Amino acid sequence: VEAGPWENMAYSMDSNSINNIDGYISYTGWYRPYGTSQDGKTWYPTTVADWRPILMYVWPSKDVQAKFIQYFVNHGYENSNYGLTTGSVKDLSENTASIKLNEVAQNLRYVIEQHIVAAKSTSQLANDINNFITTIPELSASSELPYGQVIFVNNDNTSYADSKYRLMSRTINNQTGNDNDNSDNGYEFLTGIDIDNSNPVVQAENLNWEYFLLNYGKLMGYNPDGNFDGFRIDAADHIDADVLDQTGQLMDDMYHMKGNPQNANNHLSYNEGYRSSAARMLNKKGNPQLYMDYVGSTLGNVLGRANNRDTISNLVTGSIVNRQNDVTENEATPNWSYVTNHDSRANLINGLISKDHPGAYKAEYANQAWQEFYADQKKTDKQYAQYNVPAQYAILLSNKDTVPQIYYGDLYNETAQYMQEKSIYYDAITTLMKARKQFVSGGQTMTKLSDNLIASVRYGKGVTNANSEGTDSLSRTSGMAVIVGNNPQMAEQTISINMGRAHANEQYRNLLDTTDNGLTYNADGAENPETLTTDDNGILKVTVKGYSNPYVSGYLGVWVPVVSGNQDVTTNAATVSADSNKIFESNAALDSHMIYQDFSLYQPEPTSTENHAYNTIAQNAELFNNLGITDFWMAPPYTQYSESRYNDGYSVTDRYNLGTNANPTKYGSGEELANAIAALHSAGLKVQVDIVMNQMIGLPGQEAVTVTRADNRGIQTYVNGKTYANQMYFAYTTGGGNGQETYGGKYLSELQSKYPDLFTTRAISTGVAPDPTTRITKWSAKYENGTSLQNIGIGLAVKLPNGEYAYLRSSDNKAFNTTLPETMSSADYYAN
Numbered sequence: 001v002e003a004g005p006w007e008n009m010a011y012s013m014d015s016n017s018i019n020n021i022d023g024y025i026s027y028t029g030w031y032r033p034y035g036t037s038q039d040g041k042t043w044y045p046t047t048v049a050d051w052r053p054i055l056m057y058v059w060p061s062k063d064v065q066a067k068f069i070q071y072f073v074n075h076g077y078e079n080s081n082y083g084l085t086t087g088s089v090k091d092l093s094e095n096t097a098s099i100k101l102n103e104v105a106q107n108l109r110y111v112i113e114q115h116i117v118a119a120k121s122t123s124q125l126a127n128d129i130n131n132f133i134t135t136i137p138e139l140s141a142s143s144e145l146p147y148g149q150v151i152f153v154n155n156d157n158t159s160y161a162d163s164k165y166r167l168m169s170r171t172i173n174n175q176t177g178n179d180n181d182n183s184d185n186g187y188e189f190l191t192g193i194d195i196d197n198s199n200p201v202v203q204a205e206n207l208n209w210e211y212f213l214l215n216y217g218k219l220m221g222y223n224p225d226g227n228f229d230g231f232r233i234d235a236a237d238h239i240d241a242d243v244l245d246q247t248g249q250l251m252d253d254m255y256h257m258k259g260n261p262q263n264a265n266n267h268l269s270y271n272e273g274y275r276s277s278a279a280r281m282l283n284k285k286g287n288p289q290l291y292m293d294y295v296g297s298t299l300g301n302v303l304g305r306a307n308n309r310d311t312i313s314n315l316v317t318g319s320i321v322n323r324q325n326d327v328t329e330n331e332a333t334p335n336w337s338y339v340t341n342h343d344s345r346a347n348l349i350n351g352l353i354s355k356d357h358p359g360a361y362k363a364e365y366a367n368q369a370w371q372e373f374y375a376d377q378k379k380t381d382k383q384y385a386q387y388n389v390p391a392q393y394a395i396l397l398s399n400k401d402t403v404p405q406i407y408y409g410d411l412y413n414e415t416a417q418y419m420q421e422k423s424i425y426y427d428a429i430t431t432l433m434k435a436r437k438q439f440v441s442g443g444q445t446m447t448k449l450s451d452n453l454i455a456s457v458r459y460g461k462g463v464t465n466a467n468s469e470g471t472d473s474l475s476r477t478s479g480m481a482v483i484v485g486n487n488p489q490m491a492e493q494t495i496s497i498n499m500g501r502a503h504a505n506e507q508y509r510n511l512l513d514t515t516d517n518g519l520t521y522n523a524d525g526a527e528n529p530e531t532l533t534t535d536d537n538g539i540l541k542v543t544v545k546g547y548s549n550p551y552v553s554g555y556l557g558v559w560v561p562v563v564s565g566n567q568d569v570t571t572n573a574a575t576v577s578a579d580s581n582k583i584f585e586s587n588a589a590l591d592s593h594m595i596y597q598d599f600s601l602y603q604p605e606p607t608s609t610e611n612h613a614y615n616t617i618a619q620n621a622e623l624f625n626n627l628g629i630t631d632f633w634m635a636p637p638y639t640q641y642s643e644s645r646y647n648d649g650y651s652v653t654d655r656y657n658l659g660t661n662a663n664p665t666k667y668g669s670g671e672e673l674a675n676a677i678a679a680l681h682s683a684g685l686k687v688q689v690d691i692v693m694n695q696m697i698g699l700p701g702q703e704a705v706t707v708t709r710a711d712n713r714g715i716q717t718y719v720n721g722k723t724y725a726n727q728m729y730f731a732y733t734t735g736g737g738n739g740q741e742t743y744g745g746k747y748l749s750e751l752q753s754k755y756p757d758l759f760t761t762r763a764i765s766t767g768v769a770p771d772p773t774t775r776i777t778k779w780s781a782k783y784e785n786g787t788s789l790q791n792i793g794i795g796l797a798v799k800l801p802n803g804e805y806a807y808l809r810s811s812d813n814k815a816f817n818t819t820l821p822e823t824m825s826s827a828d829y830y831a832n
């Protein structure tokens with residue numbers, strides 16, 4: 001038998017003629033048989049270009065084999081001379097005899113080869129195979145059960161991808177496991193390939209990564225200054241909280257923060273979270289990072305809505321700090337707060353999209369939403385945009401026991417080129433920002449006046465409460481009164497504001513007041529003059545009413561002491577702590593800080609080198625200082641997934657490549673980053689990097705992994721009554737770039753030498769220390785909890801009829817012996 005069906009065997013038994021992922025074969029995959037035939041008699045050898053889809057030759061069961069035959073005969077491949085018509089195959093099924101189905105399938109092969117020769121290509125065949133796959137539940141992508149995630153699990157078939165660790169949802173107070181707080185503590189999975197931050201080797205790699213960022217410019221040989229001072233921690237509610245302990249440990253080891261509030265405050269770190277249980281967690285740990293406060297939502301519900309506003313009293317209570325009469329130090333949870341951030345603006349725009357492209361797929365256009373938003377922002381009767389933006393900032397910037405965070409997109413038109421266009425709110429917000437540096441310090445009292453209308457008073461540096469004498473020389477000339485109403489039809493009336501007994505018989509300047517059309521900064525259109533003077537007890541009598549304009553819907557008024565010139569009420573941090581077990585303490589020295597978010601998701605790509613965000617912030621370094629900003633939050637500077645929607649930094653490909661001249665990020669190059677940070681340092685600011693330990697989206701390398709269908713907590717779940725566990729999945733899991741290759745684990749030896757305690761301190765979740773003996777030069781499933789569903793499908797893995805997976809040895813892959821289906825391998829099969 002020199003010519004025959006034995007030529008269905010693979011040309012060679014290796015990767016050169018058989019598609020495989022880690023040795024495992026796919027039903028969507030292709031192979032090169034030795035030869036092919038269009039009639040059964042004449043057989044021709046393949047060249048290197050003549051490959052065929054495996055679904056012509058092998059199937060997961062007799063049922064699918066019969067449905068393959070039936071489908072192909074019904075969709076173009078009918079031929080009565082080879083026993084293949086719509087009624088000859090109509091009654092085939094899984095119960096049909098095996099040799100009969102094999103014979104019918106062999107005849108179809110000949111008819112397919114006739115089709116191939118008629119078309120001079122396999123293009124139509126490839127399309128028919130893909131179309132057939134979608135009609136089988138088990139072969140299509142829909143087998144993975146949208147929408148959600150899968151967890152990677154242990155299996156001897158995917159032994160390389162095994163793990164002892166994968167401790168899922170060890171988040172916030174659930175570090176130990178054991179959720180007995182009846183409170184929202186967050187969950188492991190968000191979106192993309194979830195990094196196992198429970199793995200000791202990964203925990204060591206995070207410390208490496210953090211050390212790299214903290215010494216960036218030095219280690220790259222760029223600007224020798226220009227290294228990051230701290231961290232904004234992304235997705236802190238969705239990572240094993242061990243890494244929060246270990247970040248704090250590293251920073252304390254490097255910079256000696258436990259002793260000195262000065263050292264702590266110069267290396268400010270803060271955790272992104274939308275769950276109040278994080279406050280408790282951080283307090284128990286001595287506050288290694290700042291807790292993200294929820295006063296933004298309160299500000300939006302009370303001042304920002306069009307109609308159905310919450311009562312003005314919500315501003316005193318609706319926060320991690322009660323500010324009805326806040327006259328103490330070191331008691332409040334050290335926190336950071338915001339009027340807006342990049343996600344808040346995004347959720348506004350991404351719901352305006354739902355009206356413009358109604359229920360449709362977004363991925364395509366919608367700058368029309370922004371044109372609508374910009375127009376709406378200028379209107380009195382706003383459809384979509386936030387009301388009372390300046391008043392929201394006035395409250396945020398005058399609040400005690402917090403580090404306020406200003407949003408780039410509230411100072412600038414965020415979809416324009418970087419810092420090219422100022423927002424309508426630039427004047428109001430920057431006026432309040434400079435006034436903060438000059439005036440706000442001391443105890444806070446928020447007094448309700450008429451169900452709408454609240455006076456928020458700060459008593460000045462060294463003035464603890466309303467009855468105190470001043471201790472500081474600036475006590476007399478410091479403090480602020482912020483008047484905020486949220487009823488645009490409020491009756492015109494007079495009000496009495498207690499400035500404190502330290503401010504008796506004192507002249508106060510009208511810093512900001514409301515007019516018919518907007519705001520005034522020299523009392524021009526207002527109900528009050530340029531200056532008012534307190535009575536003998538320090539009460540200020542002021543006139544107020546409802547207004548309706550683009551800036552104010554209700555009332556906004558701000559009063560500060562009359563001063564001889566330049567003033568600065570920033571309190572310098574102590575060089576010895578009050579507690580010593582605490583890292584951060586909510587006091588006047590922390591309250592003197594102020595964060596600036598430098599980016600938006602809707603920031604454009606730069607049209608020139610001069611429009612690179614890093615170059616623009618190098619140019620404007622002194623402006624940020626002049627505005628009273630001392631803590632610069634920079635966007636994630638990492639290399640991005642090319643097809644990510646916003647190009648923002650969160651969809652990470654390479655943790656260590658922050659951009660080159662040839663291949664910059666959205667924000668610029670690494671050398672530009674180093675210069676930018678040095679420029680900010682020269683202006684007197686500290687700067688922190690957005691660090692993203694939760695996920696890496698868009699790794700290019702595929703890996704054969706064993707997976708189980710899970711909810712966002714990483715526990716197995718059911719979807720419309722269906723589930724699966726221990727299924728083979730050909731997921732995109734492997735990569736990291738040349739940055740990970742060259743810098744991954746590079747500084748673990750140095751860290752071990754300098755700070756041995758990093759790798760002997762046992763983590764709470766695991767009970768073992770970070771492991772510096774393995775370097776992560778490349779990411780793979782072994783260091784991953786799982787992934788969001790990748791639209792590939794679960795039932796493509798080729799199992800043989802005996803039950804075992806089909807495997808192909810190939811130099812890298814030596815887990816098992818080579819065992820392939822008889823149809824494309826066994827000479828002994830074809831001998832019969």
Ligand SMILES: C[C@H]1O[C@H](O[C@H]2[C@H](O)[C@@H](O)[C@@H](O[C@H]3[C@H](O)[C@@H](O)[C@H](O)O[C@@H]3CO)O[C@@H]2CO)[C@H](O)[C@@H](O)[C@@H]1N[C@H]1C=C(CO)[C@@H](O)[C@H](O)[C@H]1O
Pocket residue numbers: 190191234235236237238272273274297342343347650
């Ligand atoms: C995008 C953001 O998603 C997650 O935060 C979610 C909360 O999980 C979710 O509960 C909701 O928060 C509200 C909460 O439900 C409610 O109790 C309270 O009254 O109000 C909350 C705010 O309105 O919505 C937020 C987001 O809108 C994660 O916790 C965040 O880490 C995540 N942001 C990060 C992470 C990624 C990568 O996944 C980036 O896409 C994003 O830009 C970055 O900021």
Ligand SMILES: [Ca+2]
Pocket residue numbers: 187188189190194195238239240694695
């Ligand atoms: Ca996670």
